[PDB]
Amino acid sequence: FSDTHIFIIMGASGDLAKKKIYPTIWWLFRDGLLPENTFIVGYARSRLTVADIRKQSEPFFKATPEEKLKLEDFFARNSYVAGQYDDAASYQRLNSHMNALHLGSQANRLFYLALPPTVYEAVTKNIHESCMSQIGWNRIIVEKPFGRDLQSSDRLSNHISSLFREDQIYRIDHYLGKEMVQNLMVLRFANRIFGPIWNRDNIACVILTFKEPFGTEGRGGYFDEFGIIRDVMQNHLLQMLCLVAMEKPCSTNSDDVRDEKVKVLKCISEVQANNVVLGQYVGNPDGGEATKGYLDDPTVPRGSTTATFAAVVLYVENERWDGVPFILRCGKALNERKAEVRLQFHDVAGDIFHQQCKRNELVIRVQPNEAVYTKMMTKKPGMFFNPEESELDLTYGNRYKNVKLPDAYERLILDVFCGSQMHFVRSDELREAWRIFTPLLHQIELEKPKPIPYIYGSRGPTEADELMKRVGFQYE
Amino acid sequence: FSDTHIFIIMGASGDLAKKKIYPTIWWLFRDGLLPENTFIVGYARSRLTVADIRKQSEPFFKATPEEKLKLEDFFARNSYVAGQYDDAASYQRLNSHMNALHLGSQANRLFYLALPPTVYEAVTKNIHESCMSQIGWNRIIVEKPFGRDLQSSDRLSNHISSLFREDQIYRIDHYLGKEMVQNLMVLRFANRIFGPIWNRDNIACVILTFKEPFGTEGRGGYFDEFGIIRDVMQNHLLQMLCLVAMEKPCSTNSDDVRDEKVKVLKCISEVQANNVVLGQYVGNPDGGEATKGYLDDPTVPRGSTTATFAAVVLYVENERWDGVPFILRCGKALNERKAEVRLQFHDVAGDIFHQQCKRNELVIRVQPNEAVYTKMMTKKPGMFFNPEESELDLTYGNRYKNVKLPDAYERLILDVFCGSQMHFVRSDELREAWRIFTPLLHQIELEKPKPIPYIYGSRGPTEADELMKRVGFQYE
Amino acid sequence: FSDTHIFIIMGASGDLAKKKIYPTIWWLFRDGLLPENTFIVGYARSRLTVADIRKQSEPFFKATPEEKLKLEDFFARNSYVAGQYDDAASYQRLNSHMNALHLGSQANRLFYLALPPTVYEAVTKNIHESCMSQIGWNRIIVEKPFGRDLQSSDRLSNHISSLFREDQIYRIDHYLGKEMVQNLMVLRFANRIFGPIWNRDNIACVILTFKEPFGTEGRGGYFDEFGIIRDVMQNHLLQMLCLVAMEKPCSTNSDDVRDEKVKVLKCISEVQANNVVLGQYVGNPDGGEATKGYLDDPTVPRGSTTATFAAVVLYVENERWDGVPFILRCGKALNERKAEVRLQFHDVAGDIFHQQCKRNELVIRVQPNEAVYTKMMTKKPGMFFNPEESELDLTYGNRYKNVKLPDAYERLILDVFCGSQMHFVRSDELREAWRIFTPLLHQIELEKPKPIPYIYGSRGPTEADELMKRVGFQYE
Amino acid sequence: FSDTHIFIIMGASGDLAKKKIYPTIWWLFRDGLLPENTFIVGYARSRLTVADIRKQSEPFFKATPEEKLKLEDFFARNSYVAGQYDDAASYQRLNSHMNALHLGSQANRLFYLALPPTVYEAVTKNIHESCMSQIGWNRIIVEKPFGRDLQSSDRLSNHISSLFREDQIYRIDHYLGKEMVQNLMVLRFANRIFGPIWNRDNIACVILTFKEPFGTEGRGGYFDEFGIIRDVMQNHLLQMLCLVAMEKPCSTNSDDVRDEKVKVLKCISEVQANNVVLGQYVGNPDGGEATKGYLDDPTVPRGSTTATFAAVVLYVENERWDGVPFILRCGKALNERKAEVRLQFHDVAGDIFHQQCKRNELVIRVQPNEAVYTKMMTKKPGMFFNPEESELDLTYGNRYKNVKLPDAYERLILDVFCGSQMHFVRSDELREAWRIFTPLLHQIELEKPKPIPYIYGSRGPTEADELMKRVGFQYE
Ligand SMILES: O=P(O)(O)OC[C@H]1O[C@@H](O)[C@H](O)[C@@H](O)[C@@H]1O
Ligand SMILES: O=P(O)(O)OC[C@H]1O[C@@H](O)[C@H](O)[C@@H](O)[C@@H]1O
Ligand SMILES: O=P(O)(O)OC[C@H]1O[C@@H](O)[C@H](O)[C@@H](O)[C@@H]1O
Ligand SMILES: O=P(O)(O)OC[C@H]1O[C@@H](O)[C@H](O)[C@@H](O)[C@@H]1O
């Protein structure tokens, strides 16, 4: 941490760069979390200056008047380099610009690819070919999409593998940076009270939920090509499945943890359409932005088939999980914002309360209002002896009010400086993900089934509820 | 419940009768919980009138101005009968007074013995000999002490057994009427989340705690004869042990439940002095009432040996519990009021967090501020990955604010009308209790060891803490 | 054991007395297992002599020439007393005959009732009224049938309860005296390897089997009144259910054990006809004694409905067993002699051998050729990797060859001298047994359904197999 | 399997080649287990002919007169090639000799390295450089030793990794080819009866035993350089530890299985000398070959320190195993031949048999007389109620008599043709093995402690027994 570090924002000119990456690296700098000797270098097609990037990005910093001195130090340690994405000369200028930086030939190089997936191969080759420290380490941060299926992801993933070792590749699933998501492991493996119950003997099912109350909101053109499954299920929701299901690792080292995650996936068969319900939101007449359907987006092809809601049931066919359905439910334009892990436990054996009991559930609400609670039965207070539902809760907000939770990107980026791959997608992890959904996704493309309509603002298709019931979920 | 009931307060003239029993039966009447056709009959040595009892007791009723009509109906359904406790004629007048009551020869008779233990034999014989309904049922409510040891309790208990069947005898441990105490069963057998963990594989120990911040406060003369163990441990604390430890019964019928309780006790060997630490409170110089010791009570014999604090460790030598110490800790003049069940779970197997973990605990606070919470580990919020202690809680007060909790005596008495023995001490239950402590208690009487002093307002003798540590409790 | 004991064979003149009881008490005497000072007194209607009883019974003794001295000592310690069963004078002579015996007024009195059930009340009253030692203890041995249903059994059982305390009543189920039957407890509670698996998580079902290859063989007249259920299922098979299912007791004391047995039963609902298949054997044309059906017995009413085969499924609705069917299968004139406990375990979770696995079973063969074995899977020996069925066995015969196993009656009678009720039916035990089958038995009497025919020498009705399959047994 | 295969015995001239490899490949050929179109090619320094190799090896074949036709076909499909081990020309002749073989350029090439470890690098390079099929697959079989410690093994292992992919490298631990050793997985994962008990809650320890009744018997010169640990413990015994301890894999694919094995090892800390007892055999005066010690070998350096017996205790620090000692006991010149896995289960909770119980054990005897049995408690047969030790056994010999068990090398070699790496040591597997023992082995070399003497024919040092006792083994 006494070494010089260079943080290279590739695609500096872009919106992600201006709205998220620059301010994220400001907040780590601001808070004194980065190495002392850190430089930021933007690179993009445009011919820009640090001055111009500051105008673009400084609105987004949430900067105060007492950070004026820090803000200027920060911009002092910024520079820019105009260049093209497959132009070997451009990378030459970039590499010697970096070398000209205080101890640049020594410095650890960190490349954030804030760019569309179409330039990834170009960029990763050029970086490898001409921008790599000879002394320092070189890490590369990459966002999704990682291919569109197993075949496309493999093409990309072999390219990069040919160029970089796994310990230089940091693929991002930003859910891996959320407070409650990271906390899953601690909940499970720090506590004895959650050990003996975490298996097929006690859990009737697991429900992994992703919901947003807004639709595609203008930009449904980008979405139409991807779909809800690819956008949210194959990545975020399955990451959570993995943390929920993984065996306990020997250590917290990055690859012991990821070995367990990938082991979970290897245990899961390809999804059969039989277990999938799809949905597409239509407008709501009885309601501004909610009045339009998915299709009333001008950016979305007429008569499109793309699903904005998917409910899918998976199985982890191993000793601990066999037969226990994992229900993955996701969609946009729904009744709420929520991201949630919910385990529904089995009924109690030998009931002595004449069926009045309700299944216990452990609930880890990821957002909003981060909390982890158990729904359980207690004797109805007062002059009664009938049990009733209640819950023991750890609601972050009451318990920890003062504390401010860092943003996923703040956490993750810091891990790249610190070298922790634990919270980043590995290549095997990545391909197991693709082989689980790939047959279904080709099917869909091939058979192009009409999603089930769902009115904007509802909980999604009734048929999704019907499915969950069929594999042994219980609504109460 | 359409039958006439007579509630006979034996010892009506006494303080318990005036401070607790009369007002308790008022509150059940007030709230419309008793049978419509209920009569209250006081019986005591004094020559009194309903008028006099009303003057004595009505202060204690918490009566309002809108209950004026109910208060008069209540006193209308009262009467008194002056009589002596071993005088056959007195019981004759009482029995025909009862007969003269609307359907008195039919009426179900309920006898509350609000009397010292010295008259129990006299009274129960006379009642049986001359006061028993021929048509209705006859139940008898009895409070402690039930003997002073196995031998004395057996003498009393054979007397009453000769006279009444078990289903006519309602022995009271008022702890059995507390909200959280009753709730133990529902916590355990309604929930799956507390099933798999409730055994020797997961629990390192159980701590059953009884504490009061006041001393004997003048009346240490009555206490000196009994001692903390007999006063609190042999009854209340062991009742809780039983509810904590009992196997799940087939049904909630009174005798299935009590079969399980008595089964637990049969599994417990006699306490050896080796596992007992005793204590006697001395005054605190640095503090009104706290300035005096136990011995500075004028009502307490000079140089007494009686213990006001006892810590004892027991074992339930069966499949589920073998080796798991149950720590019973009790005493007066301590740092707080608390009654509490605390299970301390074992460490987690295969720790991956470098010893930073702390043992989980499940805590059912009986009083004050009734609650049930789990102490567990959560990932330290914010930019950390180190677990820290936290808890999920169900605090009655936040969750159920509006609800008012009935008093133990309100609950129990109602059960006597309804005929539920589930919450009353059975004779076998009673004698198993005595055989567990009887050898120790005779020892004490015989060897009269000097209790360990403890300053008023402290947590009790350090040596108690030393003991708990020795059998595998962990302070953190 | 230095006291005088008198063993009173009531019904000495009868066949059971001559074929079993006399020789049984000879073998205990022969082997030096009885108290030194033991007398045998026969009592029956006939006017007999010790000489006559010796002629009747000595054939059955299996006596050798070196036991000549023991045989004469034995008959020396015999006497007889002619008397009637409800004649107060007869019991007077019997009681003073006993008194005239060396220390007879002191001697412990043991009454074996080798008599039909119709005289039980008469006999037990007279014994109590006039034959009871004032100094020694008095025990009474009683065989089935104990009533024909709950109501009749209660009448008998209240009679005897009025007269004798439970610790004087020794009701017999001779299955309780079989080597493998007694061994159940040791198998279960001595071994750790059979603890964790003994519950609803691992056992798919339990099959308790009773079979005989012979029919009623002439005496089907006595049987017609009783039926297979009453004859074998309500007693023997359910005793085995109890030993299989009971929780572990605290100690091996007689009443801790029996408390657990009766606890199991209390947990079982009344059998519904829905779970019962009945059978009656018809003759086999293709085969001496096997050529006749049940009905071709001259002693059996024409067109009788009595079942010689019953398959019934029961549930023990508690924490450990809930949902696990206990299949009780019994019948006469079947393919073999066998008495057997067979637990069929569930499939393994997360199968890695492509369905080639078979459910494990633990098997305790009670008779013939006493053994306890596990059927399990082993890698097919040789150049293979496919698992196949095999078994680990403890076959008594190979392992213990020299040892001769005492007869049930030898064991039990000795327990009556030693005072061990552990292996005898208690009154609560008895009535729980009756309430489980009583509704079904009245039904049958009322609706008189035609049993399903089954050819002599077969395994019984196909429909029985169909039932077992329906509640989750698997034939492989 | 319709392809041509070439089996290249490198070091054909050697004793292993003549005594084991040639006859092994004969027996697979003889039994029709190899591909139809198989050629055998010997290569060694000597200038030999097929004729000469046949003279050398045919004694060892166990050939009959009816295999005369098969024996000639076999030798017809043999050839030889004289060559040196680092001579590029020699490999050129070998590669074109192979090409000249019916479809040789197509044929799958199988290289058995029947050679000392000193030529491994030379040979594997030359093979890679010039002998590799362009069409067929090329596999290489390699025996131990694989380095002498982590550093030496890494040098070798990086060499070969540079040249060949893991799926071309077949490292041998011949224990992996033994019937009972392979059967471990089936025992564990095919059966439910061994699932719930296979963890730290039920197992007090595991004892992995290797013993031989003969010493080094002349060739103690080769041994002196290696030692018992390196010779037997680091490989065979730890392989068995792995099969005993591994989590259940998702599938039986080679790398799922090996992932679990290597996962076990990663969970094991480096052995501390504190847990090691070492031994060296001295002669026995009271006994031919047993009269000499290790040191009385002329081939062994005077005053050597090498251990012929090692007892070591290891821990697998994970959820399933934490705290359960794995006792590895091995040595030569001992009281017997035995290779054995023995699990000793914990005592039963809540003993009701007054300490008469003994710990249960599951025993898988690998050799001699292959068997798997459980030692357990049964009620002492006859007129007793005291439990005693007994066992349920599956003894191969009684149960499977006719069947002949193939030799480890027969099994393994066949797997190389079939392409199953499941039973071969992987590189990670290999290095985890080395890091566990490497610190201890350097210590020993450095501190050269004097092993504890042990008389030839005994069970080894008393101190080994003392150790086992200290970590919670119980001798009974
Ligand atoms: O819940 P978050 O943090 O806002 O992230 C959800 C978003 O994550 C992105 O990965 C998806 O592409 C978006 O479709 C989705 O809306
Ligand atoms: O906690 P509670 O409800 O006030 O009861 C505690 C009291 O209960 C009584 O049984 C004891 O005799 C008292 O000594 C004790 O103080
Ligand atoms: O199997 P055992 O020991 O011979 O006993 C079976 C007999 O036991 C008796 O109880 C039954 O009345 C008979 O019907 C039955 O045949
Ligand atoms: O038990 P097995 O099959 O004969 O193998 C034991 C031999 O295996 C070899 O690996 C060891 O080098 C020898 O020292 C050992 O004797």
Coordinates of N, CA and C in Angstrom, one line a residue, chain B residues 104-199:
Chain B
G104 N -76.9 -24.0 45.4 CA -75.7 -24.4 46.1 C -75.3 -25.9 46.3
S105 N -76.3 -26.8 46.3 CA -76.1 -28.2 46.4 C -75.6 -28.8 45.1
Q106 N -75.9 -28.0 44.0 CA -75.5 -28.4 42.7 C -74.1 -27.8 42.3
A107 N -73.8 -26.7 42.9 CA -72.8 -25.8 42.4 C -71.4 -26.4 42.5
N108 N -70.5 -26.0 41.6 CA -69.2 -26.5 41.6 C -68.5 -25.7 42.6
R109 N -67.7 -26.4 43.5 CA -67.1 -25.7 44.6 C -65.6 -25.6 44.4
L110 N -65.1 -24.4 44.6 CA -63.7 -24.1 44.4 C -63.1 -23.5 45.6
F111 N -62.2 -24.2 46.2 CA -61.6 -23.7 47.4 C -60.2 -23.2 47.4
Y112 N -60.1 -21.9 47.5 CA -58.8 -21.2 47.5 C -58.2 -21.2 49.0
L113 N -57.1 -21.9 49.2 CA -56.5 -21.9 50.6 C -55.5 -20.8 50.8
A114 N -56.0 -19.7 51.2 CA -55.2 -18.5 51.4 C -54.8 -18.5 52.9
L115 N -54.0 -19.5 53.2 CA -53.7 -19.8 54.6 C -52.3 -20.2 54.8
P116 N -51.8 -20.1 56.1 CA -50.5 -20.7 56.3 C -50.5 -22.2 56.2
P117 N -49.3 -22.8 55.9 CA -49.2 -24.3 55.7 C -49.5 -25.2 57.0
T118 N -49.4 -24.6 58.2 CA -49.8 -25.3 59.4 C -51.2 -25.7 59.5
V119 N -52.2 -25.0 58.9 CA -53.6 -25.5 58.9 C -54.0 -26.3 57.7
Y120 N -53.2 -26.5 56.7 CA -53.6 -27.3 55.5 C -54.2 -28.6 55.8
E121 N -53.7 -29.4 56.7 CA -54.2 -30.8 57.0 C -55.6 -30.7 57.6
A122 N -55.6 -29.8 58.6 CA -56.9 -29.6 59.3 C -58.0 -29.2 58.3
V123 N -57.7 -28.3 57.4 CA -58.6 -27.6 56.5 C -59.1 -28.6 55.4
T124 N -58.1 -29.3 54.9 CA -58.4 -30.2 53.8 C -59.3 -31.4 54.2
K125 N -59.2 -31.7 55.5 CA -59.9 -32.8 56.0 C -61.3 -32.4 56.3
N126 N -61.4 -31.2 56.9 CA -62.7 -30.7 57.2 C -63.5 -30.5 56.0
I127 N -62.9 -30.0 54.9 CA -63.6 -29.7 53.7 C -64.1 -31.0 53.1
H128 N -63.2 -32.0 53.1 CA -63.6 -33.3 52.6 C -64.7 -34.0 53.4
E129 N -64.6 -33.8 54.7 CA -65.5 -34.4 55.6 C -66.9 -33.8 55.5
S130 N -67.0 -32.5 55.2 CA -68.3 -31.9 55.3 C -68.7 -30.8 54.3
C131 N -67.9 -30.5 53.3 CA -68.2 -29.3 52.5 C -68.2 -29.5 51.0
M132 N -68.2 -30.8 50.6 CA -68.0 -31.3 49.3 C -69.3 -31.3 48.6
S133 N -69.5 -30.7 47.4 CA -70.7 -30.9 46.6 C -71.0 -32.3 46.4
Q134 N -72.2 -32.7 46.4 CA -72.5 -34.1 46.0 C -72.7 -34.2 44.4
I135 N -73.2 -33.0 43.9 CA -73.5 -32.9 42.4 C -72.3 -32.3 41.7
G136 N -71.9 -31.1 42.1 CA -70.8 -30.4 41.4 C -69.4 -30.9 41.7
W137 N -68.5 -30.4 41.0 CA -67.1 -30.8 41.2 C -66.5 -30.0 42.3
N138 N -65.5 -30.5 43.0 CA -64.8 -29.8 44.0 C -63.3 -29.7 43.8
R139 N -62.8 -28.5 43.6 CA -61.4 -28.3 43.4 C -60.8 -27.6 44.5
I140 N -59.5 -27.8 44.8 CA -58.8 -27.2 45.9 C -57.5 -26.5 45.5
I141 N -57.4 -25.2 45.7 CA -56.2 -24.5 45.3 C -55.3 -24.3 46.5
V142 N -54.0 -24.7 46.3 CA -53.1 -24.7 47.4 C -51.8 -24.1 47.0
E143 N -51.2 -23.3 47.9 CA -50.0 -22.6 47.6 C -48.8 -23.2 48.4
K144 N -47.6 -22.7 48.2 CA -46.5 -23.3 48.9 C -46.4 -22.6 50.3
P145 N -45.7 -23.3 51.2 CA -44.8 -24.3 50.9 C -45.4 -25.6 51.0
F146 N -44.9 -26.6 50.1 CA -45.4 -27.9 50.2 C -44.4 -28.7 50.9
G147 N -44.4 -28.7 52.2 CA -43.4 -29.4 53.0 C -42.1 -28.6 53.0
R148 N -41.2 -29.0 53.8 CA -39.8 -28.4 53.8 C -38.8 -29.2 53.2
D149 N -39.1 -30.5 52.9 CA -38.2 -31.5 52.2 C -39.1 -32.7 51.8
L150 N -38.4 -33.7 51.3 CA -39.1 -34.9 50.9 C -40.0 -35.6 51.9
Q151 N -39.5 -35.6 53.1 CA -40.3 -36.3 54.1 C -41.5 -35.5 54.6
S152 N -41.4 -34.2 54.8 CA -42.5 -33.4 55.2 C -43.5 -33.2 54.1
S153 N -43.0 -33.1 52.9 CA -43.9 -32.9 51.8 C -44.7 -34.2 51.5
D154 N -44.0 -35.3 51.7 CA -44.7 -36.6 51.6 C -45.9 -36.7 52.6
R155 N -45.6 -36.4 53.9 CA -46.6 -36.4 54.9 C -47.9 -35.6 54.5
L156 N -47.6 -34.4 54.1 CA -48.7 -33.6 53.6 C -49.4 -34.1 52.4
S157 N -48.6 -34.5 51.4 CA -49.1 -35.0 50.2 C -49.8 -36.3 50.3
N158 N -49.5 -37.2 51.2 CA -50.3 -38.4 51.4 C -51.6 -38.2 52.1
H159 N -51.6 -37.2 53.0 CA -52.9 -36.8 53.6 C -53.9 -36.4 52.6
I160 N -53.5 -35.4 51.8 CA -54.4 -34.9 50.7 C -54.7 -35.9 49.7
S161 N -53.8 -36.8 49.3 CA -54.1 -37.9 48.4 C -55.1 -38.8 48.9
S162 N -55.0 -39.1 50.2 CA -56.0 -39.9 50.9 C -57.4 -39.4 50.7
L163 N -57.5 -38.0 50.8 CA -58.8 -37.3 50.8 C -59.3 -37.0 49.3
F164 N -58.4 -36.4 48.5 CA -58.8 -35.9 47.1 C -58.0 -36.6 46.0
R165 N -58.6 -36.7 44.9 CA -57.9 -37.3 43.7 C -57.1 -36.2 43.1
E166 N -56.0 -36.5 42.3 CA -55.1 -35.5 41.7 C -55.9 -34.5 40.9
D167 N -57.0 -34.9 40.3 CA -57.7 -34.0 39.5 C -58.6 -33.1 40.3
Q168 N -58.4 -33.0 41.6 CA -59.1 -32.1 42.4 C -58.1 -31.2 43.1
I169 N -56.8 -31.4 42.9 CA -55.8 -30.7 43.6 C -55.0 -29.8 42.6
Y170 N -55.0 -28.5 43.0 CA -54.3 -27.6 42.1 C -53.3 -26.8 42.9
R171 N -52.1 -27.4 42.8 CA -50.9 -26.8 43.5 C -50.4 -25.7 42.7
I172 N -50.1 -24.6 43.3 CA -49.6 -23.5 42.6 C -48.1 -23.1 42.6
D173 N -47.6 -22.9 41.4 CA -46.3 -22.3 41.3 C -46.7 -21.1 40.4
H174 N -46.8 -19.9 40.9 CA -47.3 -18.8 40.1 C -46.4 -18.4 38.9
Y175 N -45.1 -18.7 38.9 CA -44.3 -18.6 37.7 C -44.9 -19.4 36.5
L176 N -45.7 -20.4 36.7 CA -46.4 -21.1 35.7 C -47.5 -20.3 35.0
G177 N -47.8 -19.2 35.6 CA -48.8 -18.2 35.1 C -48.2 -17.0 34.4
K178 N -46.9 -16.9 34.3 CA -46.3 -15.8 33.6 C -46.3 -15.9 32.1
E179 N -46.5 -14.9 31.4 CA -46.6 -14.9 29.9 C -45.5 -15.6 29.2
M180 N -44.3 -15.2 29.5 CA -43.1 -15.8 28.9 C -42.8 -17.2 29.3
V181 N -43.2 -17.5 30.5 CA -43.0 -18.9 31.0 C -43.9 -19.9 30.3
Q182 N -45.2 -19.5 30.2 CA -46.1 -20.3 29.4 C -45.7 -20.4 28.0
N183 N -45.2 -19.3 27.4 CA -44.8 -19.2 26.0 C -43.6 -20.2 25.7
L184 N -42.8 -20.6 26.6 CA -41.7 -21.5 26.4 C -42.2 -22.7 25.5
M185 N -43.3 -23.3 25.8 CA -43.7 -24.5 25.0 C -44.0 -24.1 23.6
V186 N -44.6 -23.0 23.3 CA -45.0 -22.5 22.0 C -43.7 -22.2 21.2
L187 N -42.8 -21.5 21.9 CA -41.5 -21.2 21.3 C -40.9 -22.5 20.7
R188 N -40.7 -23.5 21.6 CA -40.1 -24.8 21.3 C -40.9 -25.6 20.3
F189 N -42.2 -25.9 20.5 CA -42.9 -26.9 19.7 C -43.7 -26.4 18.6
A190 N -43.9 -25.1 18.5 CA -44.6 -24.5 17.3 C -43.6 -24.2 16.2
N191 N -42.3 -24.0 16.5 CA -41.3 -23.6 15.5 C -40.3 -24.6 15.2
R192 N -40.0 -24.7 13.9 CA -39.1 -25.6 13.4 C -37.7 -25.0 13.6
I193 N -37.6 -23.7 13.5 CA -36.3 -23.1 13.7 C -35.7 -23.3 15.0
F194 N -36.4 -23.8 16.0 CA -35.8 -24.1 17.3 C -35.9 -25.6 17.7
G195 N -36.2 -26.4 16.8 CA -36.2 -27.9 17.0 C -34.9 -28.5 16.9
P196 N -34.2 -28.5 15.7 CA -33.0 -29.1 15.5 C -31.8 -28.7 16.4
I197 N -31.9 -27.5 17.0 CA -30.8 -27.0 17.8 C -31.0 -27.3 19.3
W198 N -32.1 -27.8 19.7 CA -32.5 -27.9 21.1 C -32.0 -29.2 21.7
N199 N -30.7 -29.4 21.8 CA -30.1 -30.6 22.3 C -28.7 -30.5 22.6

